[model samples]
Target: DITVYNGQHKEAATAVAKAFEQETGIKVTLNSGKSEQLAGQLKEEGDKTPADVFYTAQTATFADLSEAGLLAPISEQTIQQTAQKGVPLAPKKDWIALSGRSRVVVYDHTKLSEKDMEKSVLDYATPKWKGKIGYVSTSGAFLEQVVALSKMKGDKVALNWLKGLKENGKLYAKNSVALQAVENGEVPAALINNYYWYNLAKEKGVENLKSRLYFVRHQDPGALVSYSGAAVLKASKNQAEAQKFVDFLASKKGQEALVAARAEYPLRADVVSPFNLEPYEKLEAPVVSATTAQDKEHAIKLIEEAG
Candidate 1:
């Protein structure tokens, strides 16, 4: 039996895990929760943790574990196959990439034209966008954004930017709520993943959609492409079984099963997204070290102070 700490989308992760269980006689048990929450749990449990696998929708969570020396090195063949397919690998070989998603600005086109969108994510925090932008501070992607912002522009700059956002932007409990506010014209735009907008359009029919997704498509943190990955725990006695699970997740079959359940970009380029999204290769996301995990506490403190 292999236990999984699943922080990816519940449906996609469940489907993939079920497939892994079928491929091997090993029973797969998944505990789904926020990546931050699961990462904290793993750090606390250390070598005694029940989890054999750590999988999440974003790489930062794995980075956290890799830094703590809690993650075992992934199989080289798994890593090389994923990279040969042109998928971005973790800076360290402790994890293998499974899928990709882009950070996009979902805005009310009726309220603002394409020309109205700013080039830099920092620019959106300005007073000019006061009462016009929305975001959720608690999102893992948002936290990673702050961390990346700090990495690129320094913590002081990130703090100032967050403060500007606090004064100018509305905070929501969820991204979907923020997306709803944008479509209803309650806010002119929102910071959300590309998938959220696609999911909404799929649910409500794209022809009737009130909001449209805007890709930064430039060397900006706003175009951050978060990749999902999985790792085996250093503490796991079932290392061979865990490696098999990780290999399966990074395989074409695993990505196929996952994308079938959700619109996340699959493991291979030949696989197409369910949405008419701007192609991933065309996006010029600002590069950062995948091994540099988000400093969550510092990010949260700055976020609180910003408010």
Candidate 2:
């Protein structure tokens, strides 16, 4: 018996769970909720909860779990086998990357060409884009990018960019709202994770989205790639079963479900994401890792300076 807590895309999660159960005959139970809410619950429930497996769309959340000592040591063999790579050896060996989404600038196509919108995140802070773009301030996705930038680029540049955001940027509460803001031309564009825009188009139909996506320059602190991480709890009674389920999910067949269901690209190198728009090989994205609360505590302070 394995229980799955999915933090994003309820219907897509349901489809994956159904397929997993049928293939392995393992009793896989899934619960869907907001990532932040679910992370808090899992933290509060601690070792006593029946949650054997945890899945979240953001890497920073997984960093929280790793720091909390909730995760168990993962097998080196498992890490080597998965499609997603570049994550550190699991601190407790409890978690691994399952899939990932890159950050991008989504602009209203009618208002701006992809060339007009293509710029590093820092460019949004300039006076040129002032009042013309929106951003989700409370997003874990934004926090992840900020934290990574802070680490990779040093405090001065990272902090300066964040300050500019508060002064020049419009704020949206969530990523989807940011996407819609750009889609409706409420703002010319926004910095958003790629999946949210793609998912909305799928749900409301592409005709509903009057927006276009442009990947940030594949340069450092440019476009950050956020990861969806999964883990087995340290105290889980069903660890073996959960591990089996994870192995299957990281397999080629399981990853194919991502492309089939939502057209989100796969994190694994082995499984080919079915989306035909861009050649995955040609994407020159930077190595922006996931975010965690530990790092964000400092980032929040920097953001406050800008305020």
Candidate 3:
């Protein structure tokens, strides 16, 4: 039996686990939770942890494990099979990217014109956008955004941006809530992942949608593309079984399951996303490494201070 600490959406995580079990005849045990929660659990349990695989919601969570030396090295073949060209799943080869999500600005169509929407993400902090933007305070993607901005710009710049956002932006408990506010015209724009807008469109019907997604598509921190990362734990006795599971997740069939189960973009070079969204290659996301994205503790502190 192989144990999995699954941080993907429950439906997608369970689907992948079920496929792995059926194809390989390996018994799969899945423990699902938030990425940070699961990573913290693994850190606390250390070598005694029962988790053989760590499948996370974002690169930062996997980076946390790798930084602590809790992750075992992934094989080159597995890396090649699941590899996203130019996008490293891990700082080293400790993990592989299984799927991807891009950060974007979701805007209310009635409030913002096309010209008005072309500004950089940092521009949202200005006095002109005061009370016109919305965001979630506790989003992992948002925290990663803070880290990326800090690295690309500077800590002071990033901090001031967050502070400006705090004074000018409305805070929501969830990304969906922020998006909803944008759709309902409570805010002109919101910082969110591209997928959230797609999910909302899917649920509300595309014709009924009042919000549209805007890609930064530039060398800005706003275009950071994050991923769902998978790795084997160094403490696992089932190394071989764990590797097999990781391999399957990167396989074509595994990526297909992800497409069907969730609207996530597959990281494998050959697999095209099934969602009615822009092609992944066309997204001009700024280059940000998983290692740099992992240094988010300070970012979180700043976010709290902003609140």
Candidate 4:
């Protein structure tokens, strides 16, 4: 039996496990938890744990695992199988991205015209958007956005922007809550992943949604795309079996399964995203990789200071 630790969306993770079992006849014993919790578990257990694969939503978990020498190098053949060929999935080759979610601005269409929208995410920090925008302060995606901004625009500008939002923006418990605030006209817009709008539209119908998504064009920090990624653990006795599971995630079949499971953009070129949005390539997102704990910790500290 190949043990799997998964932190992806429940439906998508289940689909991957079910499909892998059916195709390879590999009995997968799956455990689920938040990425940080599972990564802590792996660190605590070390070689004694039964886990063969570690799959999670954010890149930081993978970075931690690899940093501690807990992850095995994914085979080159498996690397070539995935669609993220040019992009570095991890800072190293220890993990690969399965799907992508772009950062976007979701706005109340009735309240704001296209011209009212800011060209850059940084513009949202100005006085015009004060008391008018919402964002999830605790979101990993949002933290990564801050990290990317620090790297792309420099720390001074990024910290100032974060301070501006903290002073001006309405805080929400989660991205969904923030998006709903925008839809209900409690706020004019929100910083959120693009899929939230699609999922909301699917549930409430497009005509019913008062809010619409605006992609932050020209490779801005707001257009940073985050990945749901997978990796194999080095301590696994079933390295070969675990690698197969990792390979399958990037395969065409896996990408196809993702399309059926959620509104997320498939990393594979052969598979098309089911969401009614622009193709992933056209988003012009900035070159932002996943945040490591060192990077994330600093950003978290800064945000806390700003707030």
Candidate 5:
């Protein structure tokens, strides 16, 4: 028997649990909620909780688990399979990224041509892009990028970048609103996750999408990729069963199951994503794991300071 504290997409997680069950006859259970909220629940339940696994879309929340000593390192075999599948490994192998979404500058080609676009993400902070760029300071995806930036370059650097964006960039209440601003010509472009555009193309058809994605692949902090990740609890009595479930998530079939339910890229090399995404190898994104509360706290403060 295995139970999951699921914070990935509820429907998608259901598919993963269903697939895992039908394949091996191991029954799986899910207790679903938002990632951070579920993290809070896990903290409350602690060592006595019946849940065998904790799965989430926001990786940083696991910092609380790791900081509190609630997480178990995923098996090395599981980690190795992740590498073999061509997905970049997270810095801490305690968790596995089952699927991913890349960051991009969603541009309206009519408003600004490719030649006018900035090469590095930092370049967008310049005065020329003032009133031209847009983003949601409140979004999980945006916070993840800022956290990744702090992880790669330090808080001071991340702070300075946020300062520049506050001076030059427009703030939207939501990524959907920001994406629509780009879609309807409200703003020329906005920083956003690629999945929103993938969904846009899927909904409107690729030929009809007015906005386009610019992959900032030169190892810029702008090229950050966020993940849907899973971890076993240090307290789980069913560690062995949890290991197999984690293995099932990274398996080829498991990768396909989740990708079909969401716009995220499949972590397995053989499994192609729904949209014609640039192969995972090309992202050149920074290497990172879940952000500890210490890091996320600083990022929040900096974003607030920037405003």
Candidate 6:
């Protein structure tokens, strides 16, 4: 059985899993919950796990698995034949990025505009943005992005930015809280994952939500593409079954089912993302080279210093 423990984007995971089952007739089970706790459980279980494959909301967890030497290499032939060019699934053969989500800033339309807002994440520290920025304290995906920046940029820069964010920005424990803050005009802006804002807009209607998104595509910390990583376990009782599951997930048919469900952005270039992100093709992001394992150390330290 193929089991997926997902912490983020349940809608997408379920969609993909169902599609995989229908196409392959393989029985798959899924466990979904908070990303942090799921990662912690995977760490505790290690090789003793009943899990045939491990999947996470981002690369950091996969990097942890790779560092532990628990992941099997996804063959080079598979990468060359099936993967999108320029987007490497894994630095080593252990894991592959399944789907990508962009980080975007959401602001109240009454208070901010495309004219007033800009792309760079650093601009949030300026006096104009003081007291206007909002964010969630419990965003692991966001934390991972910060950790990546700390590695690529520097600890000092990352720490100082977090300090500014903490001091000047309002902190919420959930994305819904942050979204509501913008709706109420309590905060003019907040850093949020694209899907949250998109889902909200769909639910509340654009005019009702009073929130608009700002794309920080080119900025290092802006528009960060957090990957949903998948890896087969080395000690898997069913290595062949696990490997087949991963392959099925990366194919065009899998992407089609995922997109059709409004689950996420496909890793495949040919599959158009379901979300009407016009000019989606232009979304550009900086590459952070630190492996998931390396960045976690920096992330924990940043949290220690800031918290």
Predicted model with the maximum TM-score: 4
Full-model lDDT for every candidate: 0.81, 0.73, 0.82, 0.82, 0.82, 0.72
lDDT of 6 by residue, 34-140 (tens): 65577677768877877787767666577666777778887665554335542445667878776667778888888778888865787785567778888775786
lDDT of 5 by residue, 29-147 (tens): 99898888889888898999888999898667776777788888887877665563335454557777777788999999877878888878878877898988998889877787888
lDDT by residue for model 2 (44-65), tens: 8998978888877665677677
Residue 295 accuracy (lDDT) in model 5: 65
The estimated TM-scores of all candidates read 0.86, 0.81, 0.88, 0.91, 0.89, 0.84
Per-residue C-alpha lDDT of model 4 across residues 1-307, encoded as one tens digit per residue: 6888988888888888888888888888779999888999999999997899988877667877888999989877667655453344655688887777888889999999778898899988778898898888798888888899888989888899888898788888999999889978899988988888898787788898899888877888888888788899989999899998988888888777776778887766667766665666777767765577788888998898787
lDDT of 1 by residue, 47-166 (tens): 999999998776767766888899999878788655633366666689888777777888888778899998888888899998899988888689878877887889999999999888
Candidate 2, 236: how far from true, in Å?
Answer: 3.1
Flag regions of model 1 displaced more than 4 Å: 23-26, 40-49, 67-69, 84-92, 276-278, 290-294
RMSD of each: 2.9, 3.4, 2.6, 2.1, 2.5, 3.2
Ranking, TM-score, top scorer first: 4, 5, 3, 1, 6, 2
Candidate 6's error at 60, in angstroms?
A: 2.2
Q: Which residues of candidate 2, in runs, are more than 4 Å off?
A: 5-9, 31-49, 61-70, 73-77, 83-94, 203-209, 270-283, 288-290
Worst 10 residues of 5 by lDDT: 82-91
TM-score, candidate 1, is: 0.86
- Model 2 clash tally, residue pairs: 8
Minimal lDDT window, size 10, model 4: 82-91
User: In model 6, what lDDT does residue 8 have?
Assistant: 50
Q: What TM-score does prediction 5 earn?
A: 0.89
Which pairs clash in the backbone of model 2? 60-291, 72-93, 72-94, 73-92, 73-93, 74-93, 83-268, 84-268
The regions of model 5 sitting more than 4 angstroms off are 63-69, 84-94, 154-156
Relative to the true structure, candidate 4 reaches a TM of 0.91
